[PDB]
Design an enzyme around this catalytic site. Structure first.
Site, mmCIF file in Angstrom:
data_model
loop_
_atom_site.group_PDB
_atom_site.id
_atom_site.type_symbol
_atom_site.label_atom_id
_atom_site.label_comp_id
_atom_site.label_asym_id
_atom_site.label_seq_id
_atom_site.Cartn_x
_atom_site.Cartn_y
_atom_site.Cartn_z
ATOM 1 N N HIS A 86 0.837 -1.214 0.000
ATOM 2 C CA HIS A 86 0.000 0.000 0.000
ATOM 3 C C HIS A 86 0.859 1.246 0.000
ATOM 4 O O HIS A 86 1.938 1.242 0.591
ATOM 5 C CB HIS A 86 -0.927 0.015 1.217
ATOM 6 C CG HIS A 86 -1.886 -1.130 1.228
ATOM 7 N ND1 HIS A 86 -3.156 -1.043 0.695
ATOM 8 C CD2 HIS A 86 -1.743 -2.405 1.651
ATOM 9 C CE1 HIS A 86 -3.765 -2.207 0.824
ATOM 10 N NE2 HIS A 86 -2.926 -3.052 1.398
ATOM 11 N N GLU A 180 -5.988 2.632 11.017
ATOM 12 C CA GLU A 180 -6.626 3.703 10.226
ATOM 13 C C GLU A 180 -6.249 5.090 10.705
ATOM 14 O O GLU A 180 -5.944 5.967 9.897
ATOM 15 C CB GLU A 180 -8.154 3.530 10.251
ATOM 16 C CG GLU A 180 -8.596 2.351 9.392
ATOM 17 C CD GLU A 180 -9.980 1.793 9.750
ATOM 18 O OE1 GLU A 180 -10.637 1.272 8.823
ATOM 19 O OE2 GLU A 180 -10.407 1.854 10.939
ATOM 20 N N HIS A 265 -11.717 2.966 -0.908
ATOM 21 C CA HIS A 265 -12.114 2.385 0.373
ATOM 22 C C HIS A 265 -13.477 1.674 0.318
ATOM 23 O O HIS A 265 -14.462 2.223 -0.192
ATOM 24 C CB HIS A 265 -12.092 3.470 1.459
ATOM 25 C CG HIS A 265 -11.975 2.925 2.847
ATOM 26 N ND1 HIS A 265 -13.076 2.618 3.625
ATOM 27 C CD2 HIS A 265 -10.888 2.612 3.594
ATOM 28 C CE1 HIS A 265 -12.670 2.138 4.789
ATOM 29 N NE2 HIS A 265 -11.349 2.129 4.797
ATOM 30 N N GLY A 298 -9.401 -1.533 2.832
ATOM 31 C CA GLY A 298 -10.050 -1.246 4.117
ATOM 32 C C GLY A 298 -10.458 -2.516 4.861
ATOM 33 O O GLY A 298 -10.246 -3.638 4.367
ATOM 34 N N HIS A 328 -8.394 -7.689 -2.791
ATOM 35 C CA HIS A 328 -8.372 -8.142 -1.399
ATOM 36 C C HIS A 328 -9.618 -8.991 -1.192
ATOM 37 O O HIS A 328 -10.729 -8.533 -1.498
ATOM 38 C CB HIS A 328 -8.467 -6.949 -0.440
ATOM 39 C CG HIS A 328 -7.170 -6.246 -0.177
ATOM 40 N ND1 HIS A 328 -6.504 -5.507 -1.136
ATOM 41 C CD2 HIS A 328 -6.447 -6.114 0.969
ATOM 42 C CE1 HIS A 328 -5.410 -4.988 -0.604
ATOM 43 N NE2 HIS A 328 -5.350 -5.349 0.668
ATOM 44 N N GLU A 331 -9.870 -11.964 3.812
ATOM 45 C CA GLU A 331 -8.975 -11.563 4.889
ATOM 46 C C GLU A 331 -9.759 -11.553 6.206
ATOM 47 O O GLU A 331 -10.142 -10.498 6.720
ATOM 48 C CB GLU A 331 -8.334 -10.208 4.576
ATOM 49 C CG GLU A 331 -7.128 -9.857 5.474
ATOM 50 C CD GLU A 331 -6.732 -8.392 5.422
ATOM 51 O OE1 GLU A 331 -7.243 -7.637 4.547
ATOM 52 O OE2 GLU A 331 -5.877 -7.976 6.253
ATOM 53 N N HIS A 356 -4.431 -11.645 0.047
ATOM 54 C CA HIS A 356 -4.604 -12.520 1.235
ATOM 55 C C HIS A 356 -5.195 -13.910 0.981
ATOM 56 O O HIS A 356 -4.493 -14.898 1.121
ATOM 57 C CB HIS A 356 -5.347 -11.805 2.405
ATOM 58 C CG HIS A 356 -4.696 -10.515 2.824
ATOM 59 N ND1 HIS A 356 -3.553 -10.469 3.601
ATOM 60 C CD2 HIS A 356 -5.032 -9.229 2.575
ATOM 61 C CE1 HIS A 356 -3.218 -9.212 3.809
ATOM 62 N NE2 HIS A 356 -4.113 -8.439 3.216
HETATM 63 ZN ZN LIG Z 1 -3.333 -5.143 1.658
#
Ligand SMILES: [Zn+2]
Ligand SMILES: *[C@@H]1O[C@H](CO)[C@@H](O)[C@H](O)[C@H]1NC(C)=O
Ligand SMILES: *[C@@H]1O[C@H](CO)[C@@H](O)[C@H](O)[C@H]1NC(C)=O
Ligand SMILES: *[C@@H]1O[C@H](CO)[C@@H](O)[C@H](O)[C@H]1NC(C)=O
Ligand SMILES: *[C@@H]1O[C@H](CO)[C@@H](O)[C@H](O)[C@H]1NC(C)=O
Ligand SMILES: *[C@@H]1O[C@H](CO)[C@@H](O)[C@H](O)[C@H]1NC(C)=O
Ligand SMILES: *[C@H]1O[C@H](CO)[C@@H](O)[C@H](O)[C@H]1NC(C)=O
Ligand SMILES: [Zn+2]
Lengths: 482, 482
Positions: A86, A180, A265, A298, A328, A331, A356
């Site tokens: 990221h 965050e 996000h 996020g 993503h 996760e 992930h």
């Molecule tokens: Zn990541």
């Protein structure tokens, strides 16, 4: 004959684990023998004392990993590419404090809630609703009794690193809330244009130093600003990444460069995400060589599912356009829910890689499908431990997947927030903790090659990358063998 | 067609998870609807607050599990048979204190190192090397300023249950040290003949109350003793188990009974174990209806491997006899070591069931082999959490095995030491934690039925057991549906 049955089962497992069918040359066999001798000795000692770094929390294990002879060898290894990273978690936070907050025009503030934030400005910005007063950092440091302690307190605000993380972060929501908050705090520092350029350059310096030659980065492309108060746009940021990466390659000719995966996000409404998708398409037209595609980022347990976003994610297809996705997915510790179904949905949306896929081994039909389409998972072991998905990395679900040789790459996600750097710590966790005692040089070599194979580079560029890496691999092998 | 692919992948996962191919009648469909409604409601709430009992340590989770509507239904369910239990961990410890320790002639003493010890005797025995003064409990009891406090002290010393088990038990060697010390301490209470008889009877009462109708027990067959100091032998304890079980069945005609798996401790020298193996063969000749076979018990990480014992374990084959084995194997976090290779070796020795097989999912050839020979694992989830093999049971490796419908049974191991009772707490952990949100009534029915299938009963006896079980199942279904 039973003695033969036992030999056969062990050989079948040797051949099917990741890298098991790879042929080593005589110099590699020697390097393997030496690395395995050190690995077995470290493991024997860990079995005696139960001091085993992958089974401890990374914040407390780090200093021990740094003293490992296996870690020293992994550091020297050319690991290929870092494919899951990221934008603002990839540069050691020390430099943000010691260098960046000492730059001219740096201001600090604290919100009504008490959250630290920064702004580069001239003159001092006027009080807003999120800031009662901004204070020039130069003035602030003139008024503190002990500067060294003040600076260290800033460093503590910039990472999750702590003693007693079990006491500090009692559940996954608390750790995510802190995570965050860190992105919020450091954002005013990093998004000031001259710092932004210096940041991008330094992240390449740090990976290069760790023998990593290519990065793909999930980037929010939030507005980069000037002292004059002007803000730039997404196109400007992508141009800037390309320009800084071109500059780095000039003096580092074996460095391949970087690509950007534009991200937004997953707390956001579907209409807003549909707009990000159009932006993603436009950015792909303007920079086909720099922008690889799109992802949603996020806290996955608490945000929207891929299914929730179906209508936005189907736009490129409804317009006759391919937009590559790098979702993503999975996760999470939950099983049989709308959250782990994100893996299936990412695959139905033709994702190129799965970020992930922690929940993947609980879904054997999805696992088979993923294996058949050769769609790898990107595994980030330290991230999973720190954000509390699994406590002891010997229990990481990817162990099962390593044992059958499933397609995967290793990366570090946001190493700076965890007190890691580059890819080596994550490689140590996989090699020592997740792959078990029989993970060997073939495991490592396969993971390095996979990171080239599953990149979004042209096939002709992968061949060139492979040639550059093979030469680095040969020099590594010679060093380890002797 | 993409919509169709998604549906097919989910149907496939539905059919291959444990129980997925079982056909429910209309009354069972209704029961499943009601159970799944309550389960989904409990999980939704857990997802909101992150207070999710399988994800918490059982010591802290139990009071919440007892309040669960799902647990209430599981307690009522006829679960079939308990197939993995140890001789002295299967009777709530409260009775050992309030009842047994108030029986005439009960003494307490302390070893040189300060470890509590008990002996029933008349008259009071002479000072020895392991004990310097035996003191009668009735004497000791008035001397304290709060007898209710002294009692609770005893109860706290008979289990592992504690607040802050992360603080108290800092590693696996520490928890195992305390675990085994409990066995040493309670051993003198339980091996006095009248108590031994009463203990066996009460263990059947507790499981019966929990709607379990058959037990197989790993039993060390340690010498049982009389007030006078006289000791009995292995043959005598086997005969006593058979007689007490016969007594129980007389007044509980739906109860099937018990069998014994003779066990010995894996810290012992190979020659000593060869003696145990000869004893096992003899016990099988003398009691072919009561003694099922042999197992090796104790801390697997720190004791001898099955390979180390090859010479002893092959005695029956070299003597032309089949001695059935029920090996504990792969009860370990390590991977690729001699410890997790115990599963392969158990299988090479023709084991009938595998105790735990925690490491099984990391060995895909071994996993396939055990699947092809229909050899089940015995899963004991609370044991694995309390003894620190895994922190969050959502990460338990058996989750992957449940998703492919691997042969398995659920049992409780040593419930009394963990503050559990019978089988229902372990069934809750499996149904809510390990099997995920999609585990349903077919999951539960398959596991109950498996425990009859994989027992050591004659096929004609399994048939009768199945008939008794089916009647209890139908009544259970009618209750849940109404
Ligand atoms: Zn990541
Ligand atoms: C962050 O910095 C502030 C300001 O010095 C300080 O009060 C606080 O202790 C720091 N936070 C942490 C978690 O160390
Ligand atoms: C801060 O870092 C930048 C490069 O990013 C460079 O100008 C300089 O060397 C550093 N400043 C100091 C005082 O070290
Ligand atoms: C995925 O590929 C299939 C087959 O070409 C196509 O029908 C579909 O539109 C693609 N989906 C997306 C989201 O690009
Ligand atoms: C029981 O008491 C002993 C000796 O005093 C103590 O050290 C041990 O930890 C206790 N065991 C428990 C509470 O399981
Ligand atoms: C297991 O069975 C095989 C084949 O029948 C036999 O050779 C072997 O002796 C048996 N092993 C044991 C421990 O009974
Ligand atoms: C407890 O001991 C036995 C059960 O094993 C029972 O018959 C007896 O009534 C009980 N004793 C007391 C004092 O309640
Ligand atoms: Zn056991």
């Amino acid at each position: 004959s039973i003695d033969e049955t036992r030999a056969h089962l062990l050989l079948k497992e040797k051949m099917m684990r990741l890298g098991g069918r790879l042929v080593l040359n005589t110099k590699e066999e020697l390097a393997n023998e030496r690395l395995m001798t050190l690995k077995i000795a470290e493991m024997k000692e860990a079995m005696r004392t139960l001091i085993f770094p992958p089974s401890m929390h990374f914040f407390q294990a780090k200093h021990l990993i740094e003293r490992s002879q296996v870690f020293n060898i992994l550091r020297m290894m050319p690991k290929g590419a870092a494919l899951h990273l990221h934008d603002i978690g990839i540069v050691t936070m020390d430099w943000l404090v010691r260098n960046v907050t000492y730059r001219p025009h740096c201001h600090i503030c604290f919100t009504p809630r008490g959250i630290m934030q920064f702004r580069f400005a001239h003159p001092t910005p006027r009080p807003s609703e999120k800031c009662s007063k901004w204070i020039l950092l130069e003035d602030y440091r003139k008024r503190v009794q002990n500067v060294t302690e003040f600076d260290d307190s800033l460093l503590r605000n910039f990472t999750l690193v702590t003693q007693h993380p079990e006491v500090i972060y009692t559940n996954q929501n608390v750790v995510w809330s802190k995570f965050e908050t860190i992105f919020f705090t450091i954002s005013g520092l990093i998004h000031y244009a001259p710092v932004f350029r210096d940041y991008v350059f330094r992240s390449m310096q740090e990976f290069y130093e760790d023998n990593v030659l290519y990065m793909e980065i999930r980037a929010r492309l939030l507005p980069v600003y000037e002292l004059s108060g002007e803000h730039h746009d997404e196109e400007w940021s992508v141009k800037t990444y390309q320009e800084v990466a071109q500059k780095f390659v000039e003096t580092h000719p074996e460095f391949i460069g970087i690509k950007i995966i534009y991200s937004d996000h997953r707390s956001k409404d579907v209409a807003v995400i549909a707009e990000s998708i159009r932006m993603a398409m436009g950015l792909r037209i303007k920079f086909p060589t720099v922008v690889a595609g799109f992802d949603l980022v996020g806290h996955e347990d608490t945000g929207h599912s891929l299914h929730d976003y179906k209508e936005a994610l189907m736009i490129p297809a409804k317009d006759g356009v391919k937009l590559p996705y790098f979702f993503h997915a999975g996760e999470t510790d939950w099983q049989g829910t709308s959250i782990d179904r994100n893996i299936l949905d990412a695959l139905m949306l033709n994702t190129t890689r799965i970020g992930h896929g922690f929940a993947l081994s609980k879904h054997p039909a999805v696992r088979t499908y993923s294996w058949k389409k050769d769609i790898p998972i990107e595994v980030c072991p330290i991230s999973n431990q720190v954000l509390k998905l699994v406590s002891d990395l010997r229990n990481h679900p990817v162990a099962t997947l390593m044992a059958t040789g499933h397609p995967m790459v290793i990366s570090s996600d946001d190493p700076a927030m965890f007190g890691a750097k580059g890819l080596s710590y994550d490689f140590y966790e996989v090699f020592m903790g997740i792959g078990g005692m029989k993970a060997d040089l073939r495991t490592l070599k396969q993971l390095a090659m996979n990171s080239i194979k599953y990149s979004t580079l042209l096939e002709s560029e992968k061949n060139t990358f492979m040639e550059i890496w093979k030469k680095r691999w040969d020099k590594f092998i010679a060093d380890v063998a002797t």
